[PDB]
Chain A
Amino acid sequence: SSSQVQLVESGGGLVQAGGSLRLSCAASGFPVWQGEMAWYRQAPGKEREWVAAISSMGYKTYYADSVKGRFTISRDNAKNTVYLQMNSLKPEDTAVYYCAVMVGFWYAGQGTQVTVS
């Protein structure tokens, strides 16, 4: 029978500058190992900004210049979940964060709000 395809982000919240947060992305309907997965963020004014990605079938990671050294993407294939570890948060990191998987096209979740004082 069927399996719903869904990505559900969580772990956002309010933190004062210099703090840390770990976002989670629970995937349904596909094994996260089998897809290129990525985080992007949606800032109030700005357009979509890709921040981190991890390879299909492998461990190579990529990061936006703006988050290098601060953010780490990782994947737990047993929990079918991807994570974004965000350290030393700056107030212009404030945005809604989405996880996404490349399935012919990018398919993304619902978003989780992150606000840095």
Chain B
Amino acid sequence: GSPNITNLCPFGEVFNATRFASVYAWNRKRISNCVADYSVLYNSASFSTFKCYGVSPTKLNDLCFTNVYADSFVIRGDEVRQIAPGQTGKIADYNYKLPDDFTGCVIAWNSNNLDSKVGGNYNYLYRLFRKSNLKPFERDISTEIYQAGSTPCNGVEGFNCYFPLQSYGFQPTNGVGYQPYRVVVLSFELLHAPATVCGPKKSTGTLEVLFQ
């Protein structure tokens, strides 16, 4: 027959979501126990980045013993280079860290037309200060006052005592390096038990639905 709509993989929901997470609170969606939605399509015009590391994107079709994690968030154009193995900087250090041996794909696109507004969109936040670098795929959503000097802060902001999250200000007139970019990181979770719903790499005949 045909799969239940509950059994279609929600890749379209990842890329087409109306709102994206702030990078410090990056969102992870597990894609599992599902088969491809043949109505979901993107082209070279959709993305400015689509790079995979150590893996073909055709692995996204193999979910019988694998889950896909789609991590998504908004950062600045000039920070997209940090969503890659072996990078350092504000995003890699304190917000979203990929491992040196990363296996998976990174997709990004310019979201100026949705995420910037006249006078600035301030709803996207990043972590600016942290006592140590994030481990790969670590997530920090704490909001403790950061002690930048030797004097303890005792929970009050001042010189050397800073609230650690700060807002991007996305204006449509910003240069492209300061415009917002939506980012989707696809990685794989190897499983020990077979999926209830999935499909083989070799075609089973689903292509006929495009000509119906």
Which A residues are within 8 Å of any B CB, using their own CB?
1-7, 29-31, 34-36, 38, 48, 50, 53, 55-58, 60, 62-65, 98, 100-111
Q: Which residue of chain A is the closest to B9 with respect to CB atoms?
A: A104
Q: Tell whether B52 is near chain A: CB-to-CB under 8 Å.
A: yes
**Cα-based distance from A64 to B61 in the complex (angstroms):** 24
Interchain residue pairs with CB less than 8 A apart (11): A2-B84, A5-B57, A29-B50, A34-B58, A53-B210, A56-B58, A62-B208, A104-B9, A104-B60, A105-B60, A106-B38
**Cα-based distance from A38 to B211 in the complex (angstroms):** 11
B105 to chain A, nearest CB (A): 7
Interface size class of B (residues with CB under 8 A): 20 to 34
**Cα-based distance from A58 to B41 in the complex (angstroms):** 22
- Known contacts being A56-B201, A65-B211, is A110 close to B60, with CB within 8 Å? no
- Known contacts being A5-B105, A110-B45, is A105 close to B37, with CB within 8 Å? yes
**Cα-based distance from A58 to B201 in the complex (angstroms):** 10
Partner of B11 from A1, A64, A105, A110 at Cβ < 8 Å: A105
B212 to chain A, nearest CB (A): 10
Q: Which residue of chain B is the closest to A99 with respect to CB atoms?
A: B43
Q: Tell whether B53 is near chain A: CB-to-CB under 8 Å.
A: yes
Partner of B203 from A60, A98, A109 at Cβ < 8 Å: A60
Residues of B close to A111: CB separation below 8 A:
43
